[PDB]
Amino acid sequence: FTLIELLIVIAIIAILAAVLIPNLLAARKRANDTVVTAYLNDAVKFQEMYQIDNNSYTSNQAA
């Protein structure tokens, strides 16, 4: 094992470190939109439950 093999190893590490890491921001954006969609789907279920009890929809989240 010699300095030229070790420079090749360092060079290839620099390549793999650059390319094998995903765009984390783009991944989290799509997960975050799923949270919003899921929370609105829940708010919709609870608007219908409030409608069962009160014959009207809520304007306030605490209800």
Ligand X SMILES: *[C@H]1O[C@H](CO)[C@H](O)[C@H](O)[C@H]1NC(C)=O
Ligand Y SMILES: *[C@H]1O[C@H](CO)[C@H](O)[C@H](O[C@H]2O[C@H](CO)[C@H](O)[C@H](O)[C@H]2NC(C)=O)[C@H]1NC(C)=O
Q: Where do contacts with a copy of itself occur on this chain (CB under 8 A)?
A: 3, 6-7, 10-11, 13-14, 17, 21-22, 24, 27, 30-31, 33-34, 37-38, 41, 44, 48
Q: Which is nearer to a copy of itself, 44 or 63 (CB)?
A: 44
Q: Give the interface with ligand X as residue ranges (CB under 6 A).
A: 60, 62-63
Contacts of 63 (CB under 8 A, 6+ apart): 50
First-to-last alpha carbon distance for the chain, in angstroms, is 71
Q: Which residues bind ligand Y (CB under 6 A)?
A: 59-60
